[PDB]
Amino acid sequence: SIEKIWAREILDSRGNPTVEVDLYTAKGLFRAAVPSGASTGIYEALELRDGDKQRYLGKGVLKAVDHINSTIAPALISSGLSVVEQEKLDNLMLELDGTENKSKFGANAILGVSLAVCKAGAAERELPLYRHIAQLAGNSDLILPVPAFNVINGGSHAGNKLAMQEFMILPVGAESFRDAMRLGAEVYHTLKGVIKDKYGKDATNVGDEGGFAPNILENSEALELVKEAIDKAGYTEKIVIGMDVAASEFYRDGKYDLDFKSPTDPSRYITGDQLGALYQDFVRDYPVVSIEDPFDQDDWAAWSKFTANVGIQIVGDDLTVTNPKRIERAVEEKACNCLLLKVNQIGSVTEAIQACKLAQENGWGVMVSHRSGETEDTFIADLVVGLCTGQIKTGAPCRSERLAKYNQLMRIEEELGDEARFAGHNFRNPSVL
Amino acid sequence: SIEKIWAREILDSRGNPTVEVDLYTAKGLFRAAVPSGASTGIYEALELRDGDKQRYLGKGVLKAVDHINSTIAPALISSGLSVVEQEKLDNLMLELDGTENKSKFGANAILGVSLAVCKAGAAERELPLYRHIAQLAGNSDLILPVPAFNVINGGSHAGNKLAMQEFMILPVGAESFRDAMRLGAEVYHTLKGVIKDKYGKDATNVGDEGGFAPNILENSEALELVKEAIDKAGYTEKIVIGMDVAASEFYRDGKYDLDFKSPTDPSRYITGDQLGALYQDFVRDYPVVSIEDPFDQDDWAAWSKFTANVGIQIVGDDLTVTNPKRIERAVEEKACNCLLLKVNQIGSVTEAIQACKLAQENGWGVMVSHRSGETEDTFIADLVVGLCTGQIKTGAPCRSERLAKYNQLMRIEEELGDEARFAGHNFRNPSVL
Ligand SMILES: C[C@]1(P(=O)(O)O)C[C@H](O)N(O)C1=O
Ligand SMILES: C[C@]1(P(=O)(O)O)C[C@H](O)N(O)C1=O
Ligand SMILES: [Mg+2]
Ligand SMILES: [Mg+2]
Ligand SMILES: [Mg+2]
């Protein structure tokens, strides 16, 4: 079935090397590329980098690329398996690597091939990608997700003092996915004007995922700006707010530092209980319906307590790392109620689908996500539709490594035509539709 | 030959609507999308917007989309013309529109179809797109271009006081195109560090094309920053500097305002002779080998005079707007010696190729270019190779609406094998290769 596999080094959206794979069958060429995180969990599958400091400051992926071209490719070509057999092909790669964290080939080597196999398998079945994915997962009623656009940014890879990472808007009230795009774009452009007038003409350049990074410290101030943009755009009834705290980035000596990008002073640090109290203030005062990584990735007690005391969506990202073993624990301890699905945290399509289904079988929500380093690849657009999760976050409506996904979801909606169902207010549980 | 043509509204890289066209033949689906400028010349073909202030702040393109779906599509289908007939199909669309500047359907409507036809035509010919373009243009050779990366920005769409629009790096001394990408990315990442250290960690958010906008006024200081980054990265002998002044943006009453983003003060203004004297200093003191739009789009006297007094490349952008009639005037008056090629400045593939051939026959260089509003489309990567121009500017190595083109050029280089040649130091006159 597989005739040829050829990998290369391309540049991702931040200008860093990443893996791209060309897989050939009788039906042609199938291409996929691998994304790369900025604030990665310590439990993520291994991203293999060259570490040659003379080349791309040690960020090359020539080794991953060679593993694919020289070792993985002949193995899969010899397998006598059809590209539709995703699970058997992924399992072959997992055994050939043979390590728990994919540290021999790199998660980025294995994922690249996994994604290309999946696209080739869709064509072999004569199906669009999202339909092939639905069938791999045992689904049949497709769903267009609510997009979650980050519009204000802070955290460890933003230049301001704002400690929490992402402030997102979700047009739960839009009529369709195409309508949701209009709502998101209009509020984003509105917000640009708001920030410009208040903070200055130089305050509206964008961060890695297209969000604004005004120089503020107060997290409540970010929320106030977002709420202001929504209202001024005219969509108070139709748009709500999500947050990615990424609290692992500012966990310090059992406590949390909301001014961690200023010179270190431990008198600043607060306990998780204080932090929890802050979140409760946010949920009271703003339409915050979802909070991601509110506590450190190892701070299991704090997660379980906070989740037990709120009625909103609580999302595991660095806590769960799209990893069935960590997810089973989180389910048992009721640490959260939503999984952030990132295929390159676990490193294969089959495992990501397994992680999604384990979440869903235990009544969790699932939100498909980009990484900070993205590409022109639009795989996750089909993935979120085929897995029917009802929610995706894949950037501000700015920069085309983000828009390529949102544009593709508009095409899918169009293609499904009258069978298109938008998750809307059922983004947490879209199966009821 | 054309079975179906369907147009839709997608979002470009700034989050504004633009035109995308799907064209179906017997060989499948061929998709293209239209870019949009931020500092457009007054003589560019018309970009048709809806102007509905309630929807996308006036920037919808539903009217242009309807012109394609209702009018252009059935006409071209009923013509029975083969997609290999680029000129005949383009000419038919010009006839239907019937206006000089494509103001009936919009240059964006017409170009959308023109691009998709070209891709479909390549498939019909069973050629890669760059080879089909080469045949259309009457070329037999192919060359990989030197990339020009916009790394420091000022001008009318940057929040600093810096007047001149773009400061670019060109790895003329690279060994290959793929090597040129490494050189550019490394200098780009080095520059980010230089800016962070000199202007603060909050000064490194990116503009529309992925470059930095530090808060500076003097244009010489921008050149200082770029030189310092080149030297720090260790590539002094291999990377040179290009400028896009975009002087039409700060032309005022026959003079030029190098502080036009400060409250208006006519005592500030300088003459074209003084501005030319300033450029002379830059060319003496920095490795500037190319200056684009050094004077206003109508200031023919200043262009001719400057061009006669320097040995560097002088690029017409807003001066020439990819338009054979204005190019003929510039040729006659020796206003410049290079054409910036922007397919949507003129509105069709056929007219753009005509523009290119006219420049080359009169000994001009041609630099293929992006617009500020780009998409995930990679047509101009194939275009610059098929036209053999030896130079492209399509952004900083940041944001995938820019990387998509750079990545595609790496793929083409790889595809051409040992037949691939890199323009290098012959970027102005690649025909000697
Ligand atoms: C910064 C990011 P990653 O790059 O994935 O670490 C972006 C994503 O939105 N997310 O959840 C994050 O934590
Ligand atoms: C600002 C831009 P456009 O959007 O084309 O006006 C970008 C391009 O680099 N260029 O030459 C310009 O003048
Ligand atoms: Mg992270
Ligand atoms: Mg996260
Ligand atoms: Mg311009």
Ligand SMILES: [Mg+2]
């Ligand atoms: Mg220009």
